[PDB]
């Protein structure tokens, strides 16, 4: 029951709507020979307009339900919403969504009457779906209902696992579509969960489309069954082989849908599940390495102006990894070689200085990441970091960083976080308003914070500075209800 | 030379000086039985004066100038300012200032022909006084010369200590004042160095006035006998113990004045030097733990209209747990118990309630260990356990081992103070009101510098006030308050001519 | 049932008791002021008898047995005696004792058919007592029941302590003795189960002779409630504060003895608990570090011909410690620092003069540091640091992390104690005559059992003699022991038939 | 001027000779189906001939003279040597051979009076030559002298550096033989130094005999010009890649010479380098992976009656990494993974335990070792270990080690020791006593504690558990003086 409302002339309420003006500030530089950077600041107003209507369930489509985070999401889901407390070494606990940032994390609005900070839940501000709120499906290659699919995983408590035995042994993933050669092979002791079947039973890649056809199929009556407007689709499987993209059939939308229909080579799984989500207006989220999006994706996206991901979950490991790095680099210390090891945004920074990085010095960091097989580890996933840097005068510091935990708990709840926030940027619309009112970006451009390789536009360099996406995220939902950035100079403090 | 030339309307420039108008814009907040923030806006508008003038050379004088830090400061000027090489046997190294903050970190002004971040140096913005131009000076207990104090201290490369030996060896510490209580008897027989003797050259905590009167008499032959005009006081000296701050004693201005001319067993040596800082106009900044600010001293910095820096250098191991562990409340995680060993975090824990309440806990298991081991030398070696607790009963742990040479950390951030301090003295603002016209004389930063803190494990703020510790946040201040003075706004990090086509 | 028969003429079988014949070597030595050092070596017979017929059930009686190892121990019997499997998020885990080297190590009993290295588990040589026939019991200053002890300690797999529940609530420990002055009072309100009280049921640290014949009564009645022939004591209980050994009083066994009956404020708990155990002829083995065993009730162990242990169970972090440097100091390299953080290598820097010396220095930084941290549970984090160094000004610093549960690493440890001593108190030998055949009758090992090393920090050892912690050193003479039984030599590890064609 | 004189029977002085009688004892083991092991002991009797005349100098020739353990080699022996102390942060330090198990590590003779051990130095039982009486050369295909690989290799005190400058820089490696396929390609910025040419400069693999003949010479004139006896050649160069042992050109010594006179492709420099050290007498160690000794190397041996290596040096990270593996299956306990990351014998422990390690629990130990390649560490070689095992009733311990050190100062002191181990053992002759007098085995199996693989003969598992390689050593001194093993028994003290 927390709110918040915000003593401004800049929003003005409608009908279940929300229009906000912002001045939009940033400015252009130009570094000349003589040593001088010319600083020309740019401004470009602008009105979003915030649908208030959000939905009293949205509809939850994991492609890969079975996995991991597949069963485990639907099992904080199950456990949160029923509020199901669960039996450990440590005693009875009580559920909740740890590791969630919108549904964990605060924001500051400003200062109290003594001038010290205030704070309020992320989700707090704007409304915002909640995961219990959350009914979810999806497809699977393997038909394991989703009890044995949280055993299998070994992620979860035993008794917290019993207690959703019940609830848990209902959900079954309907059975996905499965191109071998596009996976990891030998993933044919699992696929006994497959739509592409031929006369013959045998798995099949010829019928690219009535495979599309009948995921389109699942949506509608998934969303029919269960009476939902609102549905997003969030792709947490395999990670499958990238595909060329190559003219006359990868490019524009047209090709595209054609390709699907010749069955072509290049039409991946992801492919087929990503356009069926657009053809059906439900927005996608790609939390896997494969180029899915290809050119004639993206635009039968801006076409049905529907919204997609950004690629590959950040995992909370890259995420931390980044941090320090980026810390280092800000501090005026020069790492020199960062490597990972891990068994279950370098080079831009590199950029950022010329001092620490250039010729005369040596403008390169090592780095390495290593990913190895370990069965004998149970989901907890391990990774060490060692970082290398040049301090003052001879000088040399050594950080080395063991990160330890259930790698799927740690993941979950930043898949829910995606989909909290891709539903919320759904019902955002703006416009350049100037001294039509179209929707955001087809490409969610503000859930980077949560995708490891941000999908954007062309000649673009996505930034990853970790707080630094949280911060414009932050900033975000603060322009949307009137709020400045926040600048942190306690004025009312520094100055009499 | 770096540049940067801002086009703003809100900037001109007249008689070596800069002037610059800001809007400061700020919210106050209210909550509500029923759970209702009634967040409340408020704008107040000022004109910022940085005379540009910097001085040529600004006087440094360090209490502790034997010390690691103390010599090692010294080393790197005359290193980086004669560009003197050294030998490694990495090969021929060139001096410089990595972990200076102010000298090798950058600043990000906006975006280029394209949308791609352009950064400039943090010392490019506005004109700051450069480290090659500090003037090292300053007290210590021991007359050990500065290169002994290398050798002693054995923190810089050989070959370099045997570069700057000539030069090193001429600069000797003044004598400090030695109150034998206030720290510890290991070193005493150290203490050849002192000011405070009586006829039979003994140690006496008698006559404290005198000393106070002979430290700001160092200050004034130091000024004039370099030709200075700037001067600043860093306390880099060992650590004293804490003063039982009473009524009539040091609770007031006066009263500390007198407890002084009164040879008070709570006035320490730190206070003598701070007093006398003060007295002399020249900033003093608490390098150590000891509180020495008590309320008295500060309210004579006040009246004075000197500047004064909040307690304890914030090191490495801290920096980076105001980073790591704010990190983990910002994405929702919540770290139960946290461990430091070697040889502040409450607001955060008090952040978020989501996390720490009365029904999930509110206690976060801290404890530090600081045992020492001479062999490893000025090489720390910490040690970090995070135990976090994520959803659904597991857990995440995160083990930080990390070692390097703290004076090599230390001394930059050091050399950072000064040069952002020596800074600060020459900014002045002035509230403006909307209607009236010009309605108001400049003022000074109230005299407790809380744009230091990034560099402080300890903020001395204000009465009320309650200290902020989020390292991100510390630097963040410190940027916009540079980029507002050129004419640019807060750091909005949106980019919106990417996201919104 | 694994056997391990060996043909030799040095064993023969007479009555369900083993001869075994043994020739003893070893040699003194002597150095010189040149230098030179003159190796005497020594032959002593031996006939060693081990009586065969193991007890059918080892009686057991713990002092802190509702302590995390107290019930985690009676756990594991009633696991894998009733071998009753358990569920995990892992999955359905099957009983077993790893972290026993009784029951799950091997020791190599020679070559195969080709050269081949052939293993037998360490319990098969001889016949050993097993754990799932211990039978437990106990005393406790609190009389929470086992099942609540397990709930309370929070060390074994919820489904496994629910699975136990029923077995382990019937089982209740005695009241001990409560002498508050002799531990913490953050555990004295835990002190529910007590047998020192006056009619005002109030703890008093007077009648300690009573309680001493009470502890005597409780073992008898143990015994015959069990049908019983054998018991061993081991106190597992909170840590106590060492005793001021003072002439006259526990100097000498008489004294002891009436100290107690004089209500002396020397005499602790546990020396009431070993004077009790020896006094009734149990073996009694001091599994925490408080030195129990002073002169007087060693001597009373002697005029008694019962057994004693070495104080302090040597955990798993030091374990580790005494394999770590000793490996380094076996290989030429010098660690010259070494720091134990968490929440006895004197005979290594003595052992190499080449090393420790007046030259090169012969001191080594050790410092451990034990602070809590109720998060982590049962969890402890230990972390340790060794710094040595290398020829020519090089160094090696050797950081190793390491968590896990102590209860389940100290809880094989006791049982494997138990296993040992039970073994030992049934090995009886003779000194023999190389010419005269035939003399001398059986003795026992002299009373402190100190074959029990490798199992404890601080080994009490007899006056004169010194203390070896080398782990490997300290499990080579357990096993050449075992192997010299069965009449093999000890092991050579030469493979002449591989070396040498 | 320490010595150990042992009162015994056993030991008969002769001529500078030294015959010594040795009561080997052992023992045979047959597993029954009942459960019941039946051991059979098996005592073979010897007699050692220990040649007491040292060396007053021996020769030294490092294959890969100018690396980083070739290099400090040099200067350690030369530092020592001379006693050039050298400066430092923390002061003034003088040289030493810590590291050195020879030269820095003590045995037990006994003990004392009181019942105390008595410890000696390791080289102090029996004569051994020590490190100052070495005289080094070798070869090397890049030709810069002794200081400047030095400089290069960045692994010494720059003060320790230059106070060896005038010595160091007039040691210079005698060019080397570069088959430039066998080692990792792009050697050839370094190659510079080579023997191994054609009428017109170009390297070349044709001539593969006169190659060998040239070796030889470099071998006959350093023993000749330096007035020296004994010799011992040392491989610590690049690691070849391995050969095909084919029947007809591998095999038997005649083919092989054959071979390397028909520049056959199977014929590596290392090849050469042995045969020439053999052909000449001179014991080879080959301190690199590469399968040197073939079987017509081996042979050429048994023949001309040299000595061999065992394949390469056992870092002190494989050694460290083995104890502590050892440590856990002596103690119980279970490891079940066991990492391995280091960027500059497990099989056999699963044997030892059926108890642990068998099919209804699994007798598999996972396991990876991975060495990336940073060069901004400066010779500091990082390794880090992560053991994960299982405690019991459902526990887990989790050890984790960080180990770092200079590399070289670590593999410089264990290249010493197998020389000096290498020369003692040359000294050493036996016979089956019995109720002629041959030298050792042509592979110097005692040298083992000091390398990875070491070479065995047919059907015989090599042993590693560290400790025991080198209980094994100090049980052979022991054996030669009339000591018998450490039992540890302490009976003087256990018994009254």
């Keep these: 029951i927390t709110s918040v409302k915000v003593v401004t002339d800049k929003c003005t309420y409608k009908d279940n709507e929300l229009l906000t003006k912002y001045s939009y500030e ?9 040593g001088r950077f010319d600083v020309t600041p740019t401004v470009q107003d602008y009105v979003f307009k915030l649908d208030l209507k959000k939905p009293e369930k949205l509809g939850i489509m994991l492609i890969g339900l079975g996995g991991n985070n597949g069963s485990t999401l639907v099992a904080s889901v199950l456990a949160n919403k029923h509020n199901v407390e669960f039996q450990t070494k440590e005693g009875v ?7 969630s940032m919108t549904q964990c994390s605060t924001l500051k609005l400003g200062i109290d009457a003594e001038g010290n900070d205030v704070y309020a839940p992320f989700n707090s501000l704007l409304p915002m779906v909640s995961p219990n709120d959350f009914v979810v499906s999806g ?6 209902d989703l009890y044995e699919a949280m055993q299998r995983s070994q992620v979860l408590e035993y008794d917290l696992q019993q207690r959703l035995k019940a609830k848990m042994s209902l959900v079954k993933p309907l059975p996905s579509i499965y191109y071998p050669d596009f996976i990891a092979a030998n993933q044919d002791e699992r696929a006994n969960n497959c739509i592409n079947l031929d006369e013959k039973g045998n798995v099949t890649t010829r019928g690219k489309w009535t495979h599309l056809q009948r995921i389109r199929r699942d949506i ?6 269960n009476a939902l407007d609102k549905v997003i689709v969030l792709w947490t499987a ?3 082989r990238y595909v060329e993209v190559s003219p006359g059939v990868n490019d524009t939308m047209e090709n595209l849908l054609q390709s699907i229909k010749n069955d072509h080579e290049e039409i991946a799984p992801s492919t087929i599940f990503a356009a069926a989500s657009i053809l059906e207006g439900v927005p996608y989220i790609n939390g896997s390495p494969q180029n899915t999006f290809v050119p004639g994706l993206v635009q039968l996206a801006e076409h049905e102006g529907t919204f997609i991901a950004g690629d590959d979950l950040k995992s909370g490991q890259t995420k931390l990894k980044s941090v320090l790095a980026q810390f280092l680099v800000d501090a005026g210390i020069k790492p020199v070689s960062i490597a990972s090891y891990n ?3 370098i080079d831009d920074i590199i950029a950022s200085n010329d001092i620490l990085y250039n010729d005369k010095l040596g403008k390169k960091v090592d780095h390495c990441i290593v990913i190895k097989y370990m069965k004998p580890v149970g989901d907890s996933k391990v990774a060490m970091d060692e970082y290398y840097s040049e301090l003052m005068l001879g000088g040399h510091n050594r950080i080395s960083i063991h990160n330890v935990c259930e790698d799927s708990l740690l993941a979950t709840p930043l898949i829910i976080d995606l989909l909290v926030m891709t539903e919320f940027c759904t019902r955002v619309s703006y416009k350049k308003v100037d001294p039509k009112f179209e929707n955001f970006y087809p490409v969610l451009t503000f859930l ?5 390789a941000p999908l954007t536009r062309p000649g673009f360099h996505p930034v990853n500075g970790l707080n630094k996406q949280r911060t414009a995220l932050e900033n975000f939902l ?11 100079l306690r004025f009312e403090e520094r100055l009499l």
Tied chains: 1, 4.
């Design 26 to 34: 940033n400015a252009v530089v130009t570094k000349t020979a003589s």
């Design 93 to 99: 606990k009580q559920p909740n969504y740890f590791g």
């Design 139 to 144: 497809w699977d290659i393997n038909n394991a």
């Design 220 to 225: 509608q009556n998934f969303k029919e069954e």
């Design 238 to 240: 395999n990670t499958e």
């Design 343 to 345: 068994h279950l945004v």
């Design 448 to 452: 980077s914070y949560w995708l490891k």
């Design 478 to 488: 603060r322009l949307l209800i009137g709020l400045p950035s926040q600048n942190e």
